[PDB]
Amino acid sequence: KSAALHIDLCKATSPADALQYLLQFARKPVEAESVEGVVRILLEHYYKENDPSVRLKIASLLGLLSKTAGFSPDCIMDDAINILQNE
Amino acid sequence: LHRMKDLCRYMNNFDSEAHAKYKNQVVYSTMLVFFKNAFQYVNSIQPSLFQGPNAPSQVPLVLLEDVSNVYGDVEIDRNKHIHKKRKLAEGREKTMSSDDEDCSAKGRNRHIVVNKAELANSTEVLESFKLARESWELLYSLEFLDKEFTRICLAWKTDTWLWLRIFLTDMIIYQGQYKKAIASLHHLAALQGSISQPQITGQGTLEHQRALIQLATCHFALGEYRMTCEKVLDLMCDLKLLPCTSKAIMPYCLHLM
Amino acid sequence: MKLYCLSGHPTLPCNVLKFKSTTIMLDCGLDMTSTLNFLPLPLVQSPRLSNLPGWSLKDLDKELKECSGHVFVDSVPEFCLPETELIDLSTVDVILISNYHCMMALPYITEHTGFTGTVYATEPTVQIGRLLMEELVNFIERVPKAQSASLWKNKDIQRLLPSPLKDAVEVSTWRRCYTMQEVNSALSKIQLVGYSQKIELFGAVQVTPLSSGYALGSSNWIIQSHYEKVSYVSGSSLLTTHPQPMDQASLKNSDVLVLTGLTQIPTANPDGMVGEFCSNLALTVRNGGNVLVPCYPSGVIYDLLECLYQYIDSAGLSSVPLYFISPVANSSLEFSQIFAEWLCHNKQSKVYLPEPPFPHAELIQTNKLKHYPSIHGDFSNDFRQPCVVFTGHPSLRFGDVVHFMELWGKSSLNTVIFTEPDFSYLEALAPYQPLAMKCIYCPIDTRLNFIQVSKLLKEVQPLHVVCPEQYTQPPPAQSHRMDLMIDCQPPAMSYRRAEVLALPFKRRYEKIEIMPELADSLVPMEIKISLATVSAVLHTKDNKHLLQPPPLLSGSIPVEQFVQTLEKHGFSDIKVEDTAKGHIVLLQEAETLIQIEEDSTHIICDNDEMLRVRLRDLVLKFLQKF
């Protein structure tokens, strides 16, 4: 889910609880049409987050999501290259 | 830094035709000095707003009250400490809230006691930082430069513009008007958080915290100790020593108090 | 500086440290206790387990089975892996294996996770681990069972299940047993290392295995970068065990001492428990009953076998047979025998004169110990009823131990004796609870207890200690024993599963070598201590830095000495201007000027270029670079 993940990542503590929630979320699959919203939220939290391990897990997760079904990732590579430049 | 003492030494309200060359030279020098001061203020106090989307977007700094000067023996006033603190801070010049303009003569009334290692330069950088108010005041003395500065502030949306906001924050910081700095701090949260450019986003913004600390310092200079303490608590959750990080802003709030 | 902990199990750790330019995996570990939630795999389909009543809920029923209140899973046992998705294991450069117990789960990491690094371990560890995966795969694939059970893994369904099944964690990450092809592939990616062997990893860090004394080939690792050393203390023992004792000396001067593999059941003295085990089985055998001893084929079985060899002669029980049933039984006995140089000084002295080290060769020679590969072979012909059998997995979920539990479980005469503490003997025994069999728990754990590790810590004095969070609190069974804790002068930071620890051991001053050619051109000075200046080109190869041959100044130049000493060193017509806290000196030739500040000097040239270099050099008479 999109809003549920957003609010859960907002309310979770930065260093460990957010990492655990991302770990739980990475296991369960995501429907292709909903990939855009969840990766947008992950990017927003990537900008917010200061911890390196949490950002690393966000990068790994949002790379994993790009392999899901016939999803078209041509809309999520400008923000990806941007955050890569800023990382 | 000291070149404005010669340009401003001529007749401010000189003849448009008889002294056309002198007026044009004075206006050009005033505009250049104002641009240099704005650029320096933006670089020193607005590191996040001056950085693009692919830039580092570092934590911005801020300028605080000269509390060290009052504590130091250079400005050890035996009977000018309680009521003259606002006077020592602003010089009773920046009464009005001047956006993108600094109307203050504190550069000549006092100085900045900076050693060789405390600041970047004991002659160049310190004088350039202190003379910004004097150069801007000299520019405001000339009608053409003042009109150009006012037009720039009006057209550029000085609250939204990075350089003009930094200049306004520096002017309010030295003036002691905590309300302008508080308004800038409030606008520095939503402006930075809602912009797609790379900066400090959300309530925990470095620029917003630095502006809040500057507002606390201005309130302390104005004598409103309760307001300064409230601003310091909110932030926690001519020259001065302060780091550009947001973490160091919290431990420096109590210095003004 | 970093440490990714991929497993919350204390005695089965999986830690990765992103330290320097290499990420090193410390142990693999396989949390075998997840198998206790599943129904056991029998060699022959039993009527009792097949006809167990399914569990009831408001909805499923065939996935879960109930036996004497406990609820189990009617599916193939699954194993809780370390967290593989926390850190991309493709980035792991090296894996260090300490024990054969920690050697498991390695096929998962090596095959499924895209790991292309190297694995380093000692040869007895490799061989015994190979035997363990051999017997595990043999047990699992002997009589295969389907994996139909997946509904109970659901997040909203697991909450309503009873306690043993509800408290299981990382259930979605459980995997079935690796195939033998994966085992063979994994062990092909291994490098055998001896004790105190210095292995260089890309010229960055040096790792040596050090003998831990806990098992054959058991090793502790120390990783060092020539200034910062990280010590990894896995399962170790300071008792009179067969392997050579702990090399405690090499752990000194350690910035970080990551500490795992401490004993379970710390209150138990292993010698007393060995004596109790022997006495209990002697009592059972004397009354005509049988004895079942679930154990690993190569672990603590040898020590208790030696004690049994000593005990039976005095006990007058030489007639009864000592059966050891496992697919890797003969391999275990032979590997234990041949690794004679991996023993202590007392037992490695048996190689001088011709004699096998272990005494169970004499048990075989006198036909006291009889090892078999399974139940269906010659064992069923040579089986005598009042016997003692070492077999099967200690988990009581697969192997021949399931068959023997189902066979002898109906009589009070027979007994089952648990010696491995890594499995909860009440939870492993859960799918058989209404038995009349006499169940005895006398675990034999020779690993370090908290007194021993406290003494070792005070001997070694590490700057920081890393341990599982289970050791920073007393065990839940006691919950009041302050002696069962890791007490350190530093707080001794801890970790849980999937926790990332930012270690504070970040240090500067990496080592570099300077060749004689450049050292010839380097000349020192005197200050207040020696000092020199170096200008060279840096050559780096395999993370080893070499200095190939191709602002600040310091000294004592006070205003008085400045005015006096260099007054007439070659020029003329010099005036001194009475400046505050110093003096300003300028010459009339072209208004060339020299200004001094407090603890500083600088030279000004005005329309002159030739004399400026000599002006600088004159001041350089007594100016160093400190």
XYZ file of C-alpha atoms in Angstrom, chain C residues 128-483:
356
model
C 33.166 -32.016 9.438
C 30.851 -29.388 7.947
C 30.751 -31.440 4.751
C 29.710 -34.449 6.833
C 27.010 -32.410 8.581
C 25.470 -31.160 5.331
C 25.780 -34.701 3.917
C 23.756 -36.166 6.776
C 21.282 -33.252 6.801
C 20.527 -33.573 3.080
C 20.355 -37.370 3.431
C 17.830 -37.082 6.276
C 15.698 -34.472 4.514
C 15.612 -36.175 1.101
C 15.408 -39.747 2.453
C 11.583 -39.725 2.545
C 10.599 -36.372 0.978
C 7.579 -34.421 2.196
C 5.723 -31.683 0.344
C 5.734 -27.990 1.300
C 1.955 -27.478 1.114
C 1.923 -25.367 4.303
C 1.891 -21.665 3.443
C -1.324 -20.159 4.875
C -0.022 -20.187 8.466
C 2.875 -17.908 7.451
C 0.418 -15.035 6.908
C 0.924 -12.015 9.162
C -2.711 -11.770 10.287
C -3.083 -15.540 10.802
C 0.069 -16.268 12.849
C -1.142 -14.011 15.694
C -4.033 -16.300 16.661
C -1.907 -19.456 16.767
C -0.629 -20.804 20.134
C 2.654 -19.728 21.707
C 5.391 -21.864 19.988
C 3.981 -21.086 16.537
C 3.053 -17.462 17.298
C 6.487 -16.500 18.636
C 8.330 -17.747 15.535
C 10.019 -14.818 13.797
C 11.045 -14.195 10.169
C 8.719 -17.031 9.134
C 8.436 -15.681 5.579
C 12.235 -15.979 5.252
C 12.282 -19.712 6.048
C 13.579 -22.004 3.310
C 13.629 -25.731 2.689
C 16.851 -27.732 2.888
C 19.472 -27.063 0.241
C 20.118 -29.832 -2.277
C 23.390 -31.746 -2.427
C 24.409 -30.022 -5.663
C 24.383 -26.701 -3.792
C 26.440 -28.241 -0.968
C 29.054 -29.535 -3.409
C 29.119 -26.193 -5.238
C 29.516 -24.242 -1.982
C 32.401 -26.329 -0.619
C 34.191 -25.854 -3.954
C 34.488 -22.112 -3.207
C 36.525 -22.692 -0.033
C 40.186 -22.079 0.798
C 41.769 -24.178 3.530
C 43.747 -22.178 6.091
C 45.825 -23.367 9.017
C 46.036 -21.838 12.466
C 48.037 -18.574 12.645
C 48.163 -18.373 8.832
C 48.259 -14.754 7.662
C 45.874 -14.325 4.723
C 46.071 -10.978 2.957
C 42.757 -9.732 1.551
C 43.545 -7.477 -1.444
C 46.529 -6.014 0.415
C 44.168 -4.210 2.810
C 43.554 -6.431 5.849
C 45.154 -9.548 7.316
C 43.076 -12.357 8.818
C 44.421 -15.274 10.847
C 42.407 -18.116 12.355
C 43.389 -18.797 15.955
C 42.555 -22.044 17.746
C 39.517 -21.720 20.000
C 39.706 -25.128 21.679
C 35.972 -25.773 21.313
C 36.020 -28.296 18.454
C 38.219 -29.844 15.782
C 39.179 -27.026 13.450
C 37.293 -24.487 15.565
C 38.922 -21.103 15.109
C 38.715 -17.509 16.286
C 39.569 -14.792 13.782
C 41.440 -11.514 14.189
C 41.154 -8.953 11.388
C 43.713 -6.153 11.424
C 44.730 -3.244 9.197
C 48.188 -2.679 10.809
C 46.764 -0.072 13.188
C 43.192 -1.158 14.004
C 42.512 -4.772 14.978
C 39.118 -6.484 15.198
C 38.941 -9.770 17.097
C 36.144 -12.264 16.467
C 35.633 -14.702 19.337
C 33.303 -17.501 18.247
C 32.584 -20.656 20.246
C 35.666 -21.350 22.341
C 36.618 -23.508 25.291
C 39.260 -23.292 28.015
C 38.723 -26.833 29.319
C 40.933 -29.911 28.876
C 39.437 -30.663 25.442
C 41.193 -32.548 22.652
C 41.969 -29.515 20.373
C 44.854 -27.240 21.299
C 43.749 -24.619 23.873
C 42.621 -21.072 23.159
C 45.232 -18.687 21.785
C 44.222 -15.887 24.133
C 47.463 -13.928 23.659
C 46.772 -12.960 20.030
C 43.491 -11.274 21.012
C 45.282 -8.520 22.947
C 45.471 -4.931 21.636
C 42.043 -5.222 19.998
C 40.064 -2.093 19.165
C 36.849 -4.132 18.817
C 36.174 -7.647 20.136
C 32.993 -8.980 18.559
C 32.000 -11.834 20.847
C 29.621 -14.665 19.935
C 29.244 -18.378 20.593
C 28.884 -18.270 24.353
C 27.473 -21.281 26.153
C 23.821 -21.988 26.567
C 22.695 -23.285 29.998
C 25.544 -21.449 31.814
C 24.684 -23.012 35.191
C 25.771 -26.471 33.976
C 29.245 -27.856 34.631
C 30.065 -30.094 31.624
C 32.083 -32.681 33.601
C 29.268 -33.192 36.102
C 26.731 -33.467 33.295
C 28.912 -36.023 31.475
C 29.064 -38.049 34.691
C 25.294 -37.750 35.128
C 24.707 -38.865 31.521
C 26.925 -41.925 31.995
C 25.282 -42.822 35.320
C 21.771 -42.437 33.884
C 22.459 -44.648 30.875
C 24.158 -47.235 33.099
C 21.084 -47.310 35.351
C 18.776 -47.696 32.341
C 20.890 -50.446 30.774
C 21.168 -52.369 34.056
C 17.355 -52.623 34.196
C 17.255 -54.059 30.660
C 16.074 -50.895 28.925
C 17.429 -49.201 25.826
C 19.104 -45.803 25.587
C 18.750 -43.258 22.783
C 21.265 -40.421 22.517
C 20.337 -37.836 19.858
C 23.577 -36.148 18.867
C 25.544 -34.798 15.961
C 27.845 -37.425 14.388
C 31.026 -35.459 15.101
C 30.400 -33.011 17.953
C 30.348 -33.831 21.665
C 29.812 -37.519 20.793
C 33.561 -38.238 20.958
C 34.057 -36.879 24.487
C 31.116 -38.759 25.970
C 32.239 -41.849 24.029
C 35.646 -41.638 25.728
C 33.987 -41.221 29.120
C 31.694 -44.164 28.352
C 34.697 -46.312 27.392
C 36.236 -45.489 30.771
C 32.936 -45.927 32.639
C 31.662 -49.267 31.260
C 34.795 -51.189 32.308
C 34.266 -50.300 35.968
C 30.471 -50.500 35.607
C 30.553 -54.071 34.262
C 28.576 -53.194 31.121
C 31.027 -54.292 28.420
C 28.488 -56.801 27.063
C 25.965 -54.212 25.825
C 26.491 -52.774 22.323
C 27.265 -49.149 21.489
C 25.485 -48.406 18.211
C 26.272 -45.285 16.181
C 23.890 -44.911 13.230
C 24.467 -42.127 10.704
C 25.183 -41.913 6.947
C 28.491 -40.206 7.798
C 29.396 -42.414 10.765
C 32.539 -44.075 9.405
C 33.588 -40.785 7.796
C 33.155 -39.031 11.156
C 35.228 -41.620 13.010
C 37.994 -41.596 10.389
C 38.134 -37.790 10.192
C 38.296 -37.574 13.987
C 41.163 -40.076 13.928
C 43.278 -38.558 11.152
C 43.226 -34.964 12.490
C 45.855 -35.768 15.111
C 48.013 -32.661 14.606
C 44.928 -30.514 15.336
C 44.920 -31.724 18.969
C 46.431 -30.526 22.231
C 50.003 -31.357 23.261
C 48.832 -34.307 25.379
C 46.947 -36.004 22.530
C 49.154 -34.922 19.611
C 52.055 -36.635 21.416
C 50.444 -39.936 20.332
C 51.777 -39.378 16.793
C 55.418 -39.962 17.836
C 54.905 -43.598 18.762
C 52.481 -45.492 16.480
C 49.006 -45.076 18.024
C 45.734 -43.473 16.852
C 44.877 -40.417 18.994
C 41.265 -41.127 19.941
C 40.540 -44.290 21.962
C 37.324 -45.283 20.148
C 39.560 -47.144 17.682
C 40.047 -49.503 20.631
C 36.264 -49.543 21.107
C 35.966 -50.700 17.487
C 38.864 -53.181 17.797
C 37.304 -54.886 20.833
C 33.928 -54.649 19.001
C 32.433 -52.367 21.655
C 31.427 -49.471 19.381
C 29.601 -50.553 16.216
C 28.938 -47.864 13.611
C 26.412 -48.373 10.813
C 25.229 -46.189 7.917
C 21.477 -46.702 8.523
C 18.921 -48.990 10.155
C 18.134 -51.185 7.144
C 21.651 -52.508 6.545
C 23.650 -54.804 8.806
C 22.278 -52.993 11.879
C 18.941 -54.828 11.691
C 20.864 -58.126 11.720
C 23.245 -57.228 14.570
C 20.706 -55.438 16.782
C 20.637 -56.599 20.406
C 17.876 -55.257 22.626
C 19.611 -53.822 25.751
C 21.626 -51.310 23.745
C 22.555 -47.643 23.496
C 22.158 -45.808 20.181
C 23.752 -42.533 19.096
C 21.950 -41.364 15.970
C 19.718 -38.855 14.235
C 19.464 -35.134 14.442
C 19.263 -33.692 17.980
C 16.292 -31.622 16.742
C 14.186 -34.851 16.814
C 12.672 -33.882 13.473
C 14.584 -36.093 11.014
C 17.085 -38.919 10.968
C 16.938 -42.319 12.593
C 16.180 -40.703 15.962
C 12.562 -40.218 14.829
C 12.235 -43.949 14.179
C 13.829 -44.859 17.505
C 11.640 -42.380 19.407
C 8.543 -43.844 17.751
C 9.783 -47.377 18.498
C 10.948 -47.095 22.119
C 8.579 -44.286 23.136
C 5.860 -46.634 24.386
C 7.858 -48.203 27.243
C 9.064 -46.654 30.489
C 12.172 -48.864 30.490
C 13.821 -47.020 27.593
C 15.330 -43.555 27.946
C 16.288 -40.668 25.683
C 19.265 -38.575 26.788
C 19.789 -35.087 25.392
C 23.350 -33.757 25.289
C 23.194 -30.923 22.742
C 21.901 -27.698 24.356
C 21.117 -25.882 21.092
C 17.585 -27.374 20.994
C 14.895 -26.851 23.625
C 14.463 -30.427 24.843
C 10.847 -29.757 25.832
C 10.073 -28.286 22.402
C 11.920 -30.927 20.382
C 10.044 -33.553 22.427
C 6.681 -31.858 21.803
C 5.439 -33.970 18.840
C 5.917 -37.084 21.034
C 4.608 -35.868 24.458
C 2.253 -38.713 25.626
C 5.178 -41.192 25.595
C 6.109 -43.196 28.676
C 9.830 -42.977 27.808
C 12.138 -41.654 30.534
C 13.435 -38.321 29.254
C 16.676 -36.942 30.696
C 18.245 -33.553 29.953
C 21.964 -33.344 30.748
C 23.375 -31.022 28.065
C 27.132 -30.932 27.583
C 28.240 -27.458 26.486
C 31.987 -26.901 26.778
C 31.753 -23.331 25.458
C 32.740 -20.247 27.444
C 30.551 -19.296 30.383
C 30.275 -15.789 31.765
C 32.916 -16.201 34.487
C 35.376 -17.508 31.890
C 34.595 -14.749 29.402
C 34.835 -12.132 32.178
C 38.314 -13.412 33.051
C 39.261 -13.464 29.358
C 38.019 -9.883 28.917
C 40.030 -8.688 31.922
C 43.052 -10.508 30.481
C 42.674 -9.090 26.961
C 41.273 -5.595 27.758
C 39.540 -4.759 24.447
C 38.509 -1.166 23.876
C 34.990 -2.049 22.725
C 33.018 -5.287 22.974
C 30.231 -6.400 20.637
C 27.938 -9.254 21.648
C 24.346 -10.373 21.068
C 21.855 -8.500 23.237
C 20.980 -11.830 24.894
C 24.284 -11.623 26.797
C 23.706 -8.048 28.018
C 20.703 -9.315 30.016
C 20.309 -12.332 32.301
C 18.619 -15.327 30.664
C 14.802 -15.249 30.815
C 14.600 -18.566 32.694
C 16.512 -17.085 35.645
C 16.015 -13.306 35.071
C 17.771 -12.518 38.376
C 21.333 -13.839 37.895
C 23.623 -10.820 37.541
C 26.550 -13.240 37.237
